[PDB]
């Protein structure tokens, strides 16, 4: 009885979930469609079982790695932080984390590293997103990206992370004050206006890299290169050219891939420009673009003019616009034939 | 069948699906409404729709290629003007659409710098 009930409710869940992936506003929380008569009740067990079985199913598909990982990500969005898929990928992350920990204790790194390898496969594809959802193990992401993208050996990190002294509660106060001075006394646009989410991560990477070899430049070096890999700085049209904002490269993403972030920057700039010319006197120096938890917000200094710009609407407007512009493209492209 | 659907390019999707049909033909030799055949032919409509999308996407890529080439050469000429002459204002706002170049996304100038730098690298 359980096998039939699970199969039926499982396919129902998967269909109503594909609806959420393609469409919107489907409410996959717990309460689904149980009117199948055969499916009957939904236990909470299915959605966890659904995520697990579907993730393994994707693993067993025939496609190349690119489609597999794009699909894992296009499933990682979106459920309402239940989390079913979010918790599946999350326990994968903590597995990689504990595994690299055990490598640290062990002194060398064990071969074949299954969890680390799977994490490398998934995260290579959208560095910012995996990190964003789990704002806890940024340390592991930093170390892995040191391990593979950059050329350093996964042996020279092992000692330095095994050789560390315990910060012993004393030199830290000095360390908190430290995060605060190189931050304030930095005057590099991105670090100073630190956009917020990224500030919460930022604190980590700095403290991590410092415990490695000679630091406090290497530390700022890595932190700045990371913040460069993760937030556009929107520069002003004026020839100074003073920065007007730091809006995070993850949240300007139209649709689901980062090529899209790029395409979206081309929406936000058109928006910031129309404002400056439209309301004459709002010289670029005056305008600021300020984010929040999840919103790209845009203000001239006098509080009067202030346009919001949000993941949902920016995304979906760009989606329809690209859609029927691509329609026009097909039309006159096939007009040749 | 889901793998046949989820291919990168819908061409390989369609030919792999057609091969799977030609094979199913052996084991299930009666064309009819075998539940597996129902699954298989929603798959055919599915790959047809995916091919529709792929045609549209390749056409948009064609349009972007022409727009990028044209606006790219326009940018480069108006930039050589700044290099030789003065006071040309290469900021964002450039020599606009003649009839057919494009609205000048911000993407071009970054693309322009990158492609031109590699181009210089490839010179003789």
């Amino acid at each position: 009885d359980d096998s039939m009930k699970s199969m039926n409710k499982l396919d129902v869940i998967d269909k109503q979930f594909q609806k959420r992936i393609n469409g919107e506003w489907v409410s996959t929380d717990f309460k689904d469609m149980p009117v199948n008569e055969n499916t009957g009740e939904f236990k909470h067990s299915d959605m966890v079982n659904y995520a697990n079985k579907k993730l393994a199913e994707i693993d067993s598909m025939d496609i190349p790695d690119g489609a597999k990982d794009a699909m894992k990500l296009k499933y990682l969005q979106a459920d309402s932080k239940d989390g079913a898929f979010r918790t599946a990928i999350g326990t994968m992350v903590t597995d990689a984390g504990q595994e690299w920990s055990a490598a640290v204790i062990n002194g060398k790194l064990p071969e074949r590293t299954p969890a680390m390898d799977a994490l490398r496969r998934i995260r290579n594809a959208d560095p910012q997103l995996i990190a964003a959802l789990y704002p806890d193990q940024a340390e592991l992401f930093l170390t892995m990206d040191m391990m593979d993208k950059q050329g350093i050996d996964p042996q020279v990190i092992l000692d330095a992370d095994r050789l560390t002294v315990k910060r012993s509660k004393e030199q830290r106060f000095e360390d908190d004050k430290a995060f605060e001075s190189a931050l304030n006394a930095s005057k590099a646009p991105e670090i100073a206006r630190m956009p917020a989410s990224l500030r919460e991560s930022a604190r980590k990477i700095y403290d991590s890299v410092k415990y490695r070899s000679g630091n406090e430049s290497m530390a700022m070096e890595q932190m700045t290169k990371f913040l460069k890999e993760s937030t556009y700085t929107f520069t002003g049209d004026d020839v100074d050219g003073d920065t007007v904002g730091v809006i995070p490269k993850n949240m300007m993403q139209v649709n689901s891939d980062p090529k899209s972030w790029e395409q979206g920057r081309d929406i936000l700039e058109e928006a910031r420009k129309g404002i400056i010319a439209s309301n004459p006197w709002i010289t670029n120096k005056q305008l600021t673009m300020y984010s929040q938890g999840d919103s790209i917000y845009l203000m001239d200094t006098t509080g009067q003019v202030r346009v919001r710009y949000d993941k949902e609407l920016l995304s979906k407007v760009w989606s329809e616009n690209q859609k029927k512009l691509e329609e026009k493209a097909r039309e006159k492209a096939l007009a040749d034939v | 069948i889901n793998s046949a659907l989820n291919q990168e390019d819908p061409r390989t999707a369609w030919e792999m699906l057609q091969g799977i049909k030609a094979e199913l033909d052996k084991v299930q030799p009666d064309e009819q409404m075998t539940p597996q055949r129902e699954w298989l032919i929603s798959a055919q409509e599915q790959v047809q729709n995916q091919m529709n999308a792929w045609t549209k996407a390749q056409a948009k890529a064609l349009d972007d290629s022409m727009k990028s080439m044209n606006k790219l050469d326009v940018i480069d000429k108006q930039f050589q003007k700044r290099i030789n002459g003065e006071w040309v204002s290469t900021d964002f706002k450039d020599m606009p659409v003649n009839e057919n170049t494009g609205e000048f996304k911000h993407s071009d100038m970054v693309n322009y710098a990158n492609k031109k730098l590699a181009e210089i690298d490839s010179m003789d």
Partner: peptide, 13 residues
């Protein structure tokens, strides 16, 4: 404008 693509359009809407 209202019913246009062209970048402007996306920002406006």
């Amino acid at each position: 404008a209202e019913l246009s693509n062209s970048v402007a359009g996306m920002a406006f809407r």
